[PDB]
Amino acid sequence: NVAGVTLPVFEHYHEGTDSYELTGLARGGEQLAKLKRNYAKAVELLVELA
Amino acid sequence: VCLFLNLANDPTIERIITPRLALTTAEFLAYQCEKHVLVILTDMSSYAEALREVSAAREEVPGRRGFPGYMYTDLATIYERAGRVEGRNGSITQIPILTMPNDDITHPIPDLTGYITEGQIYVDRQLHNRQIYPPINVLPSLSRLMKSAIGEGMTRKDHADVSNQLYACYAIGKDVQAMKAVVGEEALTSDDLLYLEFLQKFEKNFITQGPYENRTVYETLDIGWQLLRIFPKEMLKRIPQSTLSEFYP
């Protein structure tokens, strides 16, 4: 409530379910962890813009 | 002190006669004898009522609001008995009081009085309801001869600057209270808090005097400086730098 009227905003609430071990496709675990991190940053930025 | 009283139940002719008697004794005591005299008149609206009475007795046709037209020149006669005169070291100064009917500035009495006076001091109902013993509202008030009444040879050099700054920042403070009325306290800046606190302390101290506190002019200027020191140095836009260096620290 920044003024007389109330504005809608959102928060990146990390619910925290465990990720998925994908150890089948030659097991590039480094690549998967890096991808997860990058997309997490993307999601946070997108939530902020939203 | 030379005092005159005229109760309400007295003859009206006594009422019309009295102020001229007061003015003549003032003139004698001030000019024929070297004195400086402060004349105070109370509630000239009753003098106007007596003027209406004598007009009705003579059977002259009333005009605006039941007042004779020549009352303007009559009031001029009761005025213009002031100012200094060459060849004399004395002075005379009139400070009358009026009863405004229903807060109407366009009523003939105050309007004409303003046409033949050099300023006015207001009294506001809200301040009286706020239990501030001097209810003076200094915003609409104005004195036309400030520039010569004060100065370095006078009370002090910094007086005019202090007065102007005080007036301007009070205006801004009233505006900031209006701002707070809607925007909320959390949406304010530090500057707005400074203005509000300054305003509050100002009516607390500068305006309130007490029924017997005889403050000297230097004391009033000191109080003003103390209140000014609340704001930081840079916001004193109306203050020349030299005075700020001399007095602010």
DSSP sequence for B32-49: ITT-EEEEEE--HHHHHH
Which residue is associated with the tokens 């002075």?
Answer: B91
- CA-nearest of B40, B34, B39, B20 to B92 is B39
* Lookup: tokens for B9: 């139940």
Cβ neighbors of B191 (< 8 A, separation 6 or more) are B235
Cβ–Cβ under 8 Å, residues B20 and B78: yes
Residues from chain B contacting residue A5 (CB–CB below 8 Å): none
A:B CB pairs within 8 Å: 4
- Put residue B103 in one of left, alpha, beta given phi > 0 → left and psi -120 to 50 → alpha: left
Which residue is associated with the tokens 């400030």?
Answer: B146
Cβ–Cβ under 8 Å, residues B131 and B196: no
Question: Rounded to an integer, what distance in angstroms lies between the CA atom of residue B107 and that of residue B210?
Answer: 33
Question: Rounded to an integer, what distance in angstroms lies between the CA atom of residue B151 and that of residue B158?
Answer: 8
Phi/psi for B166 (5° steps) reads -60, -45
Identify the experimental approach: cryo-EM
Residues from chain B contacting residue A3 (CB–CB below 8 Å): 183, 187
Q: Does B181 touch chain A (CB under 8 A)?
A: no
Q: Does B61 touch chain A (CB under 8 A)?
A: no
Cβ–Cβ under 8 Å, residues B223 and B198: no
Question: Rounded to an integer, what distance in angstroms lies between the CA atom of residue B228 and that of residue B237?
Answer: 12
Phi/psi for B127 (5° steps) reads -65, -40
Residues from chain A contacting residue B187 (CB–CB below 8 Å): 2-3
- CA-nearest of B42, B53, B49 to B19 is B42
Cβ–Cβ under 8 Å, residues B26 and B92: yes
How far off is chain B from A34, nearest CA to CA, in Å?
Answer: 42
How far off is chain A from B192, nearest CA to CA, in Å?
Answer: 17
B182/A2 touch (CB, cutoff 8 Å), yes or no? no
Find, in chain B, the residue whose alpha carbon is nearest to that of A2. B187
Cβ–Cβ under 8 Å, residues B44 and B76: no
The verdict on whether residue B144 carries a ligand-binding annotation is yes
* Lookup: tokens for B14: 């006594």
A2/B187 touch (CB, cutoff 8 Å), yes or no? yes
Cβ neighbors of B220 (< 8 A, separation 6 or more) are B206
Integer-rounded Cα Rg, in Å, for chain B is: 23
A2/B183 touch (CB, cutoff 8 Å), yes or no? no
Which run of H or E residues covers position B120? strand B119-123
How far off is chain B from A3, nearest CA to CA, in Å?
Answer: 6
Cβ count within 10 A of residue A30: 8
What amino acid occupies position B153?
G
Find, in chain A, the residue whose alpha carbon is nearest to that of B181. A4
How far off is chain A from B183, nearest CA to CA, in Å?
Answer: 6
What amino acid occupies position B157?
K
Which run of H or E residues covers position B128? helix B125-129
In Å, what resolution does this model reach? 4.3
Question: Rounded to an integer, what distance in angstroms lies between the CA atom of residue B32 and that of residue B167?
Answer: 41
Phi/psi for B122 (5° steps) reads -95, 160
